[PDB]
Write a protein that binds this ligand. Structure first.
Ligand SMILES: [Zn+2]
Ligand SMILES: [Zn+2]
Ligand SMILES: [Zn+2]
Ligand SMILES: [Zn+2]
Lengths: 55, 52, 47, 114, 277, 290, 89
């Protein structure tokens, strides 16, 4: 319920999607959207990709 | 971004290869250790065959 | 026909990934991972 | 009005901050009974009674008299409509009228409706 | 449908890794859901005329777009001009888009409570311009459900047909589809009776006229589509209309009028599945 | 039943409106294809291949619906759409819709960064079909714009992805040797040395075929030196396929050149390299015959 | 690639045609090579007729392709040796 009213306090889902890159995606709706033994020289590197896609 | 606190990695390296290369490198290192012990012993009883 | 445009003159492609197919940093690649050789904006403007 | 009231209530940490925010946003006095309505409903939604809403009701009584008269009229109306509410809802409304009366925020004169 | 635009959109979608998980009505009006049946199947309405020669010309008659709020039986017949229903290129797109723009202007003129939460649209035959121009009226979602209404016979009322015919401009008239069937029954029963009158008029207009108006006592008003009657007279007129519709369906499908059940007969009544120069 | 009737009689008796209704019906069937029904996929390919050149009006709405199903949350839906692309590439190129085929190749090039292996293998098989049906100087992106993208794909550990990618590299190294430098070709050989340890003998056989194609393309010197380094270094439950690949490198590229290097490599006393020389000799003699 | 057990029939080949699965496709039926597959495989019996219809004459997969003798085996003419479809014993 805190999540629901936290969404409601942000001016609405359409107001949030106006801020985000939603209309460039050209989806008809937001409701279909879904989010998602080895050797290497180094392994503790930071993943730039999900921060890049958040940006 | 912590550039000066990144893990150890340099460009133009190649990365860690397969475990078989490490296994045969370990076999070569054990061969060199065996040859070091043979040269320390100075034993003529050891011989290398034609087939290795 | 003056069409001088201030570009971004820093193509941050990974040079190790671009001509090999592999970067050692991988997920920690500060540059971007792509292997391509199309012309840049300043090179087309010189052309 | 309901959305603004509920968002200000859930945003406000204290009833002092809530009443100061409501006096900042300056609602007219034609809806003080609706203000008492969304006070009683916001305590009625609670599983457990919190003294936040009772202190807010007492502060509304002790700033201006019109909120106190609206609380008296809605207290008589709540006694008229006791049976519409469930057990924890009536528990929370009973704690509202308790925290109005042991804190002397409402008079005992309107209690002749019982 | 630009291809390079879709390449850019798909590059955006694969950069975001965002997917698309996403690839009755006559009875839902009394189930706390307002449905205004926006149907444009009578939008391209043209009369029939004959000259002194053997050739028959096409008369640009005034089209009527139906908006049927079935909870109250409110039939808004958005009329068109005589010169606006023919002549324009791409009449399945341009005239449908103009009718959808007029419907969106009417929805903007009406209140949001006057607008419905859903739209009982027909099958998707000309719904592309309607979905293009329905951004201004997004309160009612247009879809084709299992239960529809015969909106092609919504203009078969005498007063509504006369007001549609004697209009050289977009008059956009409003009336009651069931003026007397809603004053003596529920909302779902009123929608079923209006759909029964529309389906009987679509099946056989003479039997529908004899059922709804068996005498002169069922004369309706100037803003009424169904015949003005009492509770028992309206129930008898609806029962005779359902019997005539079942007889016409049995004659069409080589079946019996009494072969359908009570719920099947109610669904068949309600519209569900059982010159020139 | 409709697929068997179309395979028996044909689509010549089918009118265009009935064909459009049947296309809409089987597209609705692919929409509500909940199970793993490849039999209706084969029937789809059979009816569209019996339509032949008549599906060229039907092409873009089918392609748009397949691309719409390729935006799904479910992996198997996009997998089946890529399988339908793999089935329909030949009948797309029957009318030679080169711009549409290049556009779908660019869209699948964007789709190449898929995180699911069955979807990736279906995409790779679709690209195998598309490269086989377009023609050589007519795909977008070209081979030099594709094989650097294909180079880290071969580092995947999944077997179907490896099989389809090695098959696509086999078709590329068979036909298009004229776009990729020999440095990148022997880098692909360096990847295939690690890729020879796959469990599937068909994968290892196609790896041997790619080694033969690259030896025909770039010359047999550095690849033979690389395999002579690798064969003495393996010494495990592999490397018989390395001897087989060495035999194909010799046999496709004139074993008189290869034989002094193999004869000198027989003089290495490393206890398995002589067995590799003799195994490659036996395999090579069996391959060349007379 | 062979086994000391699992003899096939050693029965003289007739009109029942051999048939290979995908798991061992392209190999010879005798020496398992791939060089000039010359002679069609006949499997002598009910090895094709009946329950093992369209099946592998080797390991046991769904038989999809015609099994072939290679030219190296037909050099010594091992194609006349009989049925190569494996009967487990
Ligand atoms: Zn990099
Ligand atoms: Zn053989
Ligand atoms: Zn087999
Ligand atoms: Zn046999």
């Amino acid at each position: 319920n805190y999540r629901t009213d936290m969404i409601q306090a942000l001016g609405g889902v359409e107001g949030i999607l106006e801020h985000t890159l939603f209309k460039g995606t050209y989806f008809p709706t937001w409701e279909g959207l879904f989010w998602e033994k080895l050797t290497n020289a180094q392994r503790s590197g930071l993943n730039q990709i999900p921060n890049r896609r958040f940006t | 971004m912590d550039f000066q606190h990144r893990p150890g990695g340099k460009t133009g390296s190649g990365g860690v290869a397969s475990s078989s290369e490490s296994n045969r490198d370990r076999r070569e290192r054990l061969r060199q250790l065996a040859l070091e012990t043979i040269d320390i012993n100075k034993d003529p009883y050891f011989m290398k065959n034609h087939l290795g | 026909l003056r069409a001088t445009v201030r570009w971004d003159y820093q193509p941050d492609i990974c040079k190790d990934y671009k001509e090999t197919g592999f970067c050692g940093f991988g997920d920690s690649c500060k540059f971007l991972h792509d292997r391509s050789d199309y012309k840049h904006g300043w090179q087309i403007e010189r052309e | 009005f309901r959305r603004t009231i509920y968002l200000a209530i859930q945003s406000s940490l204290d009833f002092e901050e809530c009443a100061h925010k409501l006096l900042k946003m300056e609602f007219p006095e034609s809806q003080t009974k609706e203000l008492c309505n969304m006070i009683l409903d916001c305590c009625a939604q609670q599983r457990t009674y919190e003294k936040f809403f009772g202190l807010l009701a007492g502060r509304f009584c002790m700033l201006k008299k019109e909120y106190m008269e609206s609380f008296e009229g809605i207290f008589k109306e709540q006694y008229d409509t006791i049976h519409r509410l469930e057990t924890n809802k009536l528990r929370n409304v009973a704690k509202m009228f308790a925290h109005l009366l042991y804190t002397d925020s409402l008079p005992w004169s309107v209690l002749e409706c019982i | 449908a630009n291809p390079a635009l879709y390449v850019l959109r798909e590059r955006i979608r694969k950069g975001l890794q965002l997917y698309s998980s996403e690839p009755q009505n006559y009875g839902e009006l009394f189930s706390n859901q307002i449905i205004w049946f926006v149907d444009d199947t009578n939008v391209y309405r043209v009369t029939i005329h004959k000259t002194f020669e053997g050739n028959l010309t096409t008369k640009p008659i005034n089209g009527a777009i139906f908006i049927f709020n079935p909870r109250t039986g409110q039939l808004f017949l958005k009329i068109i001009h005589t010169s606006v229903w023919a002549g324009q290129k791409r009449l399945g797109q341009l005239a449908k888009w103009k009718t959808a723009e007029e419907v969106a202007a009417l929805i903007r003129s009406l209140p949001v409570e006057e607008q419905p939460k859903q739209i009982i649209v027909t099958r998707k035959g000309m719904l592309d311009p309607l979905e293009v121009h329905l951004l201004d009226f997004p309160n009612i979602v247009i879809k084709g459900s299992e239960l529809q209404l015969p909106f092609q016979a919504c203009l078969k009322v005498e007063k509504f047909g006369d007001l549609i015919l004697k209009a050289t401009e977009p008059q956009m008239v409003l009336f009651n589809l069931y003026d007397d069937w809603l004053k003596t029954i529920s909302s779902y029963t009123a929608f079923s009776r209006l759909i029964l009158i529309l389906r009987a008029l679509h099946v056989n207009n003479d039997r529908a006229k004899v059922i709804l108006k068996p005498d002169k006592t069922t004369i309706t008003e100037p803003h009424h589509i169904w015949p003005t009657l009492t509770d028992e007279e309206w129930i008898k007129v609806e029962v005779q209309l359902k019997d005539l519709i079942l007889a016409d369906y049995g004659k069409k499908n080589n079946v019996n009028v009494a072969s359908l059940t009570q719920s099947e007969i109610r669904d068949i009544i309600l519209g569900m599945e059982i010159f020139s120069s | 039943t409709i697929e068997k009737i179309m395979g028996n009689l044909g689509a010549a008796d089918i009118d265009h409106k009935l064909e459009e209704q049947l296309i809409d019906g089987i597209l609705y069937a692919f929409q509500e294809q909940t199970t793993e029904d490849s039999v209706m996929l084969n029937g789809f390919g059979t009816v569209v291949n019996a339509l032949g050149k008549r599906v060229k009006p039907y092409l873009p709405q089918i392609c748009g619906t397949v691309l719409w199903r390729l935006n799904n949350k479910s992996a198997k839906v996009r997998q089946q759409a890529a399988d339908l692309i793999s089935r329909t590439a030949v009948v797309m190129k029957t009318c030679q819709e080169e711009k549409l085929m290049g556009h779908l190749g660019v869209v699948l090039y964007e789709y190449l960064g898929e995180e699911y292996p069955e979807v990736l293998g279906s995409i790779l098989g679709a690209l195998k079909a598309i490269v086989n049906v377009i023609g050589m100087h007519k795909m977008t992106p070209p081979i030099k714009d594709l094989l650097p993208r294909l180079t880290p794909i071969l580092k995947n550990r999944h077997e179907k992805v490896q099989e389809n990618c090695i098959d696509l590299v086999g078709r590329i190294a068979d036909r298009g040797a004229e776009y990729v430098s020999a440095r990148e070709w022997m880098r692909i050989c360096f990847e295939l040395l690690e890729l020879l340890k796959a469990h599937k003998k068909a994968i290892r056989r196609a790896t041997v075929n790619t080694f033969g194609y690259i030896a025909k393309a770039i010359g047999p010197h550095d690849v033979l030196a690389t395999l002579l380094n690798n064969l003495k270094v393996q010494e495990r439950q592999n490397r018989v396929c390395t001897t087989v690949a060495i035999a194909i490198v010799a046999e496709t590229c004139s074993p008189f050149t290869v034989l002094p290097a193999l004869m000198n490599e027989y003089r290495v006393p490393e206890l398995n390299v002589q067995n590799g020389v003799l195994k490659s000799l036996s395999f090579l003699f069996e391959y060349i015959g007379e | 690639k062979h086994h000391p057990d699992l003899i096939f029939c050693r029965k003289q080949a007739g009109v029942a045609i051999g048939r290979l699965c995908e798991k061992c496709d392209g190999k010879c039926v005798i020496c398992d090579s791939y060089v000039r597959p010359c002679t069609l495989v006949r499997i002598c019996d009910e090895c094709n007729y009946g329950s093992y219809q369209g099946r592998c004459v080797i390991c046991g997969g769904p038989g999809v392709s015609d099994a072939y003798y290679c030219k190296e085996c037909t050099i010594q003419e091992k194609d006349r040796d009989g049925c190569p479809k494996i009967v487990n014993l």
